[PDB]
Amino acid sequence: SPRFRGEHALRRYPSGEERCIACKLCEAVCPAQAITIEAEPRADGSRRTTRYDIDMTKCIYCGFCQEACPVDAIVEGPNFEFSTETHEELLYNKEKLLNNGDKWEAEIAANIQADYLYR
Amino acid sequence: GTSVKPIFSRDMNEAKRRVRELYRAWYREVPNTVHLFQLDISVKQGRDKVREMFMKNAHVTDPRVVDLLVIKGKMELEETINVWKQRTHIMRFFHETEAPRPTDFLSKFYVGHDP
Amino acid sequence: GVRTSPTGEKVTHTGQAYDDGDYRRVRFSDRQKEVNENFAIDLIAEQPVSEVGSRVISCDGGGGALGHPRVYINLDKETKTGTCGYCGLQFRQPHH
Amino acid sequence: SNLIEVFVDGQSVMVEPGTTVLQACEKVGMQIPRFCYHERLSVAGNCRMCLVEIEKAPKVVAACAMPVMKGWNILTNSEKSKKAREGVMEFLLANHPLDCPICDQGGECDLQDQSMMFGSDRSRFLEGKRAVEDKNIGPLVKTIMTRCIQCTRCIRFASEIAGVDDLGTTGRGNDMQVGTYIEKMFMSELSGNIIDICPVGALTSKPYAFTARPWETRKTESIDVMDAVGSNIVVSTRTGEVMRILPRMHEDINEEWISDKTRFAYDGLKRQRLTQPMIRNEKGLLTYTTWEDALSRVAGMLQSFQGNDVAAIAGGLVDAEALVALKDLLNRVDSDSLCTEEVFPTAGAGTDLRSNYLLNTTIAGVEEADVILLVGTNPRFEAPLFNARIRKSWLHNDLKVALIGSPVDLTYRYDHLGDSPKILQDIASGNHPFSQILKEAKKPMVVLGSSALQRSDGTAILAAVSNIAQNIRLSSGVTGDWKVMNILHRIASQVAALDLGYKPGVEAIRKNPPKVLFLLGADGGCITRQDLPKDCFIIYQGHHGDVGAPMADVILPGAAYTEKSATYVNTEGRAQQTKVAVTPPGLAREDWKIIRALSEIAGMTLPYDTLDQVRSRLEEVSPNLVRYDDVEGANYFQQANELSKLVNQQLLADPLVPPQLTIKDFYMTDSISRASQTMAKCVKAVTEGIQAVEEPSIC
Amino acid sequence: TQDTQLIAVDEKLDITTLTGVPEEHIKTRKVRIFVPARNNMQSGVNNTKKWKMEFDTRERWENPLMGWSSTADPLSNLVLTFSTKEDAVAFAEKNGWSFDVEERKVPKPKSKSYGANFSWNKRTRVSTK
Amino acid sequence: KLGLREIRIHLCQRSPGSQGVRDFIEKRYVELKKANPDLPILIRECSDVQPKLWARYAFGQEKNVSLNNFSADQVTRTLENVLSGKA
Amino acid sequence: DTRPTIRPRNDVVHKQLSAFGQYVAEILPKYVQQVQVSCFNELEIFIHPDGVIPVLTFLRDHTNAQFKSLADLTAVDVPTRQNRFEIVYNLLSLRFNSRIRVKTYTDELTPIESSVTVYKAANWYEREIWDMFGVFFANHPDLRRILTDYGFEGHPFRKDFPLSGYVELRYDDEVKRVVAEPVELAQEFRKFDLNSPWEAFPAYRQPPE
Amino acid sequence: PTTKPPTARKYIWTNHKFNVSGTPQQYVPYSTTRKKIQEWVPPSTPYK
Numbered sequence A: 001s002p003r004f005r006g007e008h009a010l011r012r013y014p015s016g017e018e019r020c021i022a023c024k025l026c027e028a029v030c031p032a033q034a035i036t037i038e039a040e041p042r043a044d045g046s047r048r049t050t051r052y053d054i055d056m057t058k059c060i061y062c063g064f065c066q067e068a069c070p071v072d073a074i075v076e077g078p079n080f081e082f083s084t085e086t087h088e089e090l091l092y093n094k095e096k097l098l099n100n101g102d103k104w105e106a107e108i109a110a111n112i113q114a115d116y117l118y119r
Numbered sequence B: 001g002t003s004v005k006p007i008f009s010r011d012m013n014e015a016k017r018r019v020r021e022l023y024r025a026w027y028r029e030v031p032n033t034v035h036l037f038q039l040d041i042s043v044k045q046g047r048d049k050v051r052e053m054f055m056k057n058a059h060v061t062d063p064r065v066v067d068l069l070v071i072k073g074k075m076e077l078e079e080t081i082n083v084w085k086q087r088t089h090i091m092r093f094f095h096e097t098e099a100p101r102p103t104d105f106l107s108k109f110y111v112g113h114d115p
Numbered sequence C: 001g002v003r004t005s006p007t008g009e010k011v012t013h014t015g016q017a018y019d020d021g022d023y024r025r026v027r028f029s030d031r032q033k034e035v036n037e038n039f040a041i042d043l044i045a046e047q048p049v050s051e052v053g054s055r056v057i058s059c060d061g062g063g064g065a066l067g068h069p070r071v072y073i074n075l076d077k078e079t080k081t082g083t084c085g086y087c088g089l090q091f092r093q094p095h096h
Numbered sequence D: 001s002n003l004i005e006v007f008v009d010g011q012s013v014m015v016e017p018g019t020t021v022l023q024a025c026e027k028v029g030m031q032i033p034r035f036c037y038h039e040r041l042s043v044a045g046n047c048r049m050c051l052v053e054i055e056k057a058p059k060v061v062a063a064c065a066m067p068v069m070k071g072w073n074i075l076t077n078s079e080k081s082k083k084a085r086e087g088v089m090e091f092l093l094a095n096h097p098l099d100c101p102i103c104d105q106g107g108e109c110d111l112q113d114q115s116m117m118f119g120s121d122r123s124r125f126l127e128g129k130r131a132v133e134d135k136n137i138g139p140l141v142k143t144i145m146t147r148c149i150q151c152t153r154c155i156r157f158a159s160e161i162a163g164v165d166d167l168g169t170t171g172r173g174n175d176m177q178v179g180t181y182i183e184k185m186f187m188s189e190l191s192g193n194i195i196d197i198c199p200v201g202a203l204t205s206k207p208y209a210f211t212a213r214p215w216e217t218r219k220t221e222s223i224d225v226m227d228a229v230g231s232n233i234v235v236s237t238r239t240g241e242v243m244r245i246l247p248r249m250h251e252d253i254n255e256e257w258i259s260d261k262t263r264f265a266y267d268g269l270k271r272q273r274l275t276q277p278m279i280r281n282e283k284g285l286l287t288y289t290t291w292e293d294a295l296s297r298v299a300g301m302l303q304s305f306q307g308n309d310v311a312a313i314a315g316g317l318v319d320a321e322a323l324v325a326l327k328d329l330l331n332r333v334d335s336d337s338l339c340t341e342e343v344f345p346t347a348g349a350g351t352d353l354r355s356n357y358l359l360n361t362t363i364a365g366v367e368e369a370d371v372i373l374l375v376g377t378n379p380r381f382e383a384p385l386f387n388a389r390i391r392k393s394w395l396h397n398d399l400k401v402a403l404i405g406s407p408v409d410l411t412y413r414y415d416h417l418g419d420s421p422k423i424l425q426d427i428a429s430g431n432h433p434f435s436q437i438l439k440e441a442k443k444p445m446v447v448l449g450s451s452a453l454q455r456s457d458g459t460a461i462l463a464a465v466s467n468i469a470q471n472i473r474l475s476s477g478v479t480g481d482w483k484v485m486n487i488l489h490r491i492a493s494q495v496a497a498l499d500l501g502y503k504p505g506v507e508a509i510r511k512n513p514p515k516v517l518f519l520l521g522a523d524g525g526c527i528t529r530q531d532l533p534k535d536c537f538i539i540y541q542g543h544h545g546d547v548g549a550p551m552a553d554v555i556l557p558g559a560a561y562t563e564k565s566a567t568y569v570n571t572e573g574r575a576q577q578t579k580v581a582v583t584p585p586g587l588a589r590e591d592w593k594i595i596r597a598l599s600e601i602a603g604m605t606l607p608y609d610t611l612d613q614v615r616s617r618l619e620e621v622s623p624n625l626v627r628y629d630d631v632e633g634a635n636y637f638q639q640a641n642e643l644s645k646l647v648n649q650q651l652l653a654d655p656l657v658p659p660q661l662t663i664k665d666f667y668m669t670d671s672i673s674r675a676s677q678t679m680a681k682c683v684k685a686v687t688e689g690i691q692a693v694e695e696p697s698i699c
Numbered sequence E: 001t002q003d004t005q006l007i008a009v010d011e012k013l014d015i016t017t018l019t020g021v022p023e024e025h026i027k028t029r030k031v032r033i034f035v036p037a038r039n040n041m042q043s044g045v046n047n048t049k050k051w052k053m054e055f056d057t058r059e060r061w062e063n064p065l066m067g068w069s070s071t072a073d074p075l076s077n078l079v080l081t082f083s084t085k086e087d088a089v090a091f092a093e094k095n096g097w098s099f100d101v102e103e104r105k106v107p108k109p110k111s112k113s114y115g116a117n118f119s120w121n122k123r124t125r126v127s128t129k
Numbered sequence F: 001k002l003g004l005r006e007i008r009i010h011l012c013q014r015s016p017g018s019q020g021v022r023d024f025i026e027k028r029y030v031e032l033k034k035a036n037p038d039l040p041i042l043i044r045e046c047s048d049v050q051p052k053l054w055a056r057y058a059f060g061q062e063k064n065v066s067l068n069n070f071s072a073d074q075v076t077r078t079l080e081n082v083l084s085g086k087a
Numbered sequence G: 001d002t003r004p005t006i007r008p009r010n011d012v013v014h015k016q017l018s019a020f021g022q023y024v025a026e027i028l029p030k031y032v033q034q035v036q037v038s039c040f041n042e043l044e045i046f047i048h049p050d051g052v053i054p055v056l057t058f059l060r061d062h063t064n065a066q067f068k069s070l071a072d073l074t075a076v077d078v079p080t081r082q083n084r085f086e087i088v089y090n091l092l093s094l095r096f097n098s099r100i101r102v103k104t105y106t107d108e109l110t111p112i113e114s115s116v117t118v119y120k121a122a123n124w125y126e127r128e129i130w131d132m133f134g135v136f137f138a139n140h141p142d143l144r145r146i147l148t149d150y151g152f153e154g155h156p157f158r159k160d161f162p163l164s165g166y167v168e169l170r171y172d173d174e175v176k177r178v179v180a181e182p183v184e185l186a187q188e189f190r191k192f193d194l195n196s197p198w199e200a201f202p203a204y205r206q207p208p209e
Numbered sequence H: 001p002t003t004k005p006p007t008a009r010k011y012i013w014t015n016h017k018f019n020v021s022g023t024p025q026q027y028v029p030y031s032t033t034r035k036k037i038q039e040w041v042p043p044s045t046p047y048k
């Protein structure tokens, strides 16, 4: 279903600008403390993260982060086939999560359009 | 109130009596533990470990604390006798993997900030 | 744009790259360093500035409930542009 | 016995007349909601959040401004009181921006918390919100002014506490805006305090921006060492990193304020840090080495010289533990040349009597004063919170202030007597008109800055000022418990060093230059390699590479004041201890532990292996050094005054000029604030203008 | 007062041998007993009412893999709450923790008068409102 | 070699046991300083402290006599002996 | 009911439970220290630790009580009390379709009486309380650890026990077995200070000191 | 997608990639933040 909670992703506006403005609400609400965030003013003055890690082996895939997010920046995507041969590839980076967003945005956005009126 | 109720012992001599009984039981159990768990240590080593575990609490003067220590020691003895503990549990009294921590001021100063 | 370090390591959008003496570069050997090549700062820099004819403009990020919390931006400074503090879109009054 | 009886929800309390409704509720443990009200500011009564029902009274009253009447029953939880609060919160949130995720106030706001606790949970505002343009008031306070709720706290603070009338409101009605009208910097030593008093994210810290959320920070309570006030602070840390500095309330020292150097110079704690031991290679250059190697080098140099051949200089940021450890170590080689960079007159009593070298009236005591005399000092920049207390007493107690020195701006009007030190002799002999003012005064106070003791005639200046203080105490014009004589110190390590028997100033080392020189955080540049024989073996121990580190033969990386539990004695004499917020970086170590390790390697092991043991040693040397938060009285001013009359030194004709005449001289004073880029931005903004330092505050 | 066979005991309660705490984290720790300061960012006083027990902060380093904050201190997050200072010191003493306790700092009463803002001859008069 | 480097006088402002040393400092300390201008005589008063005299000699060797309930004449004798050998 | 959000209050059950609490306090004055009914109609009996067996047996066997089921037996740690441990008995009466809570107290060194003779269900609950809080139960048929690892030191549910404890476990290839070491965390737990500086509930305000 | 194609974005991958675990294209984590503490660099000029 469109509500399915799989692999996480960081999303952008149509302009290509990131949605995350580093409020840290997802990190505050994360039941497993799987989200690690560091932020600072960007060179253009924007409020943006410099660290955004999700320990996917700490994660319980509850979807509380995407509920807390006020800008639909962090989501749980539809992907569920991302098993790894080592423990280290499951400790996600900001680059990893942004590449997940760019990889899956086409269907992530369709799922969100399907379910956002219930949210 | 001014006074308190005992666990078992109404005095320090009673606490000592039970401590001696527990020490006796542990001392006799050690060879059977060494044989049964197939430990790579000697019976002298195990009995010295039992003594050193007893000697950690030699400073205790409260008969109720002594009674609870005896209760926990008997619990540990029953885990050892009934083979509820594994070999790894028996061998955890001997911190064979942990490196020798520093004790003097200079080495502790060299390796970090901890007092 | 995504540049290169003097060691040849790729520099991320947060400006991270190990120095030439950092042993931690051994983690990328026989592997790759994962870098997102879409720098959001350069992307939002490419967007035009809207010439709206009002002192106060409102921006919710586009898509209504799918954008960001709706905010109001003052456009009285004639040297600066009023930009949204959520999505970076810029606004300015017509031709001053 | 003139207390009246009022009721707070039926419970009776006895209050002094003039107590407001808010205070009467405060003494039963009930905190009335408020935005504009601050207990340390004047009453404004504009936010209307404190409205409360008086039983039998049809109209609600502003609890913050309304004095209680006899027999009044305050209904703090009646439906009328709740509806007043809900309406006021609705009006406050009508035009408030939806900035909580992007606003640094989120999680510790007040608007958020009182919306949750006292306002409704939903909106019925169906219109477009207000938006005002941002104001730039310097590189320290980011003003996102469309978040402002017009509580006037910043304006009241700036006008009363800081003494600068730059903040204000322009326009009226819904488009009334808080600012400076013109484009003008809000430069003041106390400027950063309008961030904390601001209930919302309208005024925020630029250095702290976007960097942390309130809930994730760990709060370590410690003491400021950027001056000798000893302001109580909270150090916010997160994941092993110092995040910001906040004021911590102490009614007797700093109230709830800190100076801008205290607030923002923590930027320097991340730059130019000494992290590893260093020695000189065969090419003469400093290179990293192990602790054992460097310590063995120093110990080899230690046990080859003795007496006057080994000396030590203590810098301005050094704890008492390190001071006593270094003194013990140097005494082991029979060395008594343990000096400080800051000179205090050693003639007469010198350091023997503790009352000779501290603020005897205490920081809280200037409120009780009738008249204060300031000599050769700029308390505004030397000790900003002491000057804030002086202005507080100038404002409420109608304190009269006179000054000898440069006509420096002090944020309050005072009477300028002159700048030549000859006036002190003029007052002491009773010829000057101000001598009568001091004589006809119940609680006079004479404050001599430690900055004026750095002169070559500082001994004569101290003698003349003591002659002034004694001349008004030999007549029955002041009680015995009141202390008139005070020394205002500007160096955080100075009073502890004097207490422990350090020699004030580095004249002993100039008299007998050492072959071994311990530079214990000494970055003043008083002693350079040209004042030392040819091959002096200079040790530097500290946390920053600023001045002393370049010239040293060995470098011992020490801990900064946020990285150790350390005793610091303030200008009035009370010992206070910091606590570690983070550990020292790299291989840096606690300073007394470095000295103890060096002593053991040298074969002269100091008799303490622990912080409690070094603190008991401190107790053995001077027992007041472990009486934390207690100000111990020091007596025998008359002994010091009759000892001071034998030195018969003269006064120079040189005018008394403070080292800091304007704000640009305030920011950059020690090694931490010289490594601070925020202090550099402050200096740049002060010296050039508002367009010099630029930063896009666009989110 | 009751039939419990009241046995005489010393008034130095010591439960350190029963807590299971490793010996390093008893003698070498130093707890702080204090009422937390009011967060100067807010004007709410509801967090300055109870006494706190916090341990001395130890070393936090950076994780080589992710740059996370690592620790080897089991008591880095342990924070106990107490109603009075006496309860906190009794708890610290029976647990064998060396402690320093500081006196609670409360705001001193202050004389607030709105009518002072318009004084006829005092400096308390405000130039703006 | 083991000459006297400094003396520390610890006392209390109000405690009756430090009253003799308080009197000594009031009436005799200035003469002691005029006779010993280069000797550090560090007088440190602290509340509820038992009166104590410290004498630091060469190479960090210190010894403390106790001055509790001393008369000013006794503190004068105790300082005379410390400052002149006998002790 | 024009209040669709507020939980409805049932005063009949409140009165019934109040009357039964008065009844229980009157029948056993020797052990009942306090009885109270919550705003959500839950009745608690506060007793001296000596009265555990008498009060529990009365509630089980009295024809007007018939609390035949021991729903739960747990402990609560409150360090600021000299008797830090609060022992909680939750009992259910099928005959009267009612529930009751019985609470007493103890410290680290005073044994609570085992109630296995009253309820056979108490056998594992008392073992669990001993395991996680360290409370001794005198005359327990078999008192020992139930939840924690063999040889585990400490009582984890005490408020002063650290969340991750003191030891970790890993397999060591040199000694060819699982070993225990002092705990190190690659990422330490991040302590959050969440409490608001403003009072939420005035009705629960404690009087000032 | 033939009947309802996804919305075109310029940042969406134009080439889908499968699970590259166990390949030299696998993801390896690293810290994305810059160094916190700057050390003091000694002068290159000797004092003597």
Ligand code: SF4
Pocket: A026, A029, A030, A031, A032, A033, A034, A035, A054, A058, A059, A060, A061, A062, A063, A064, A065, A066, A076
């Ligand atoms: S899904 Fe849940 S556990 Fe996973 S990161 Fe989001 S909030 Fe944390």
Ligand code: SF4
Pocket: A019, A020, A021, A022, A023, A024, A025, A026, A027, A037, A065, A068, A069, A070, A071, A072, A073, A074, D101
């Ligand atoms: S992902 Fe969303 S909730 Fe998390 S910090 Fe960014 S904006 Fe806030």
Ligand code: SF4
Pocket: D096, D097, D098, D099, D100, D101, D103, D104, D105, D106, D107, D109, D110, D111, D112, D147, D199, D200, D201, D202
């Ligand atoms: S000040 Fe900031 S956190 Fe507070 S209500 Fe306004 S936007 Fe939200």
Ligand code: SF4
Pocket: D147, D148, D149, D150, D151, D152, D153, D154, D155, D178, D197, D198, D199, D200, D202, D203
């Ligand atoms: S800027 Fe802040 S302190 Fe000043 S009036 Fe506005 S809300 Fe109040």
Ligand code: FES
Pocket: D033, D034, D035, D036, D037, D044, D045, D046, D047, D048, D049, D050, D051, D062, D063, D064, D065
């Ligand atoms: S608090 Fe009384 S009106 Fe603002």
Ligand SMILES: [K+]
Pocket: D105, D194, D195, D196, D197, D198, D199, D200, D201, D202, D203, D204
């Ligand atoms: K603010």
Ligand SMILES: [Zn+2]
Pocket: C059, C060, C061, C068, C084, C085, C086, C087, C088, C089
């Ligand atoms: Zn926008």
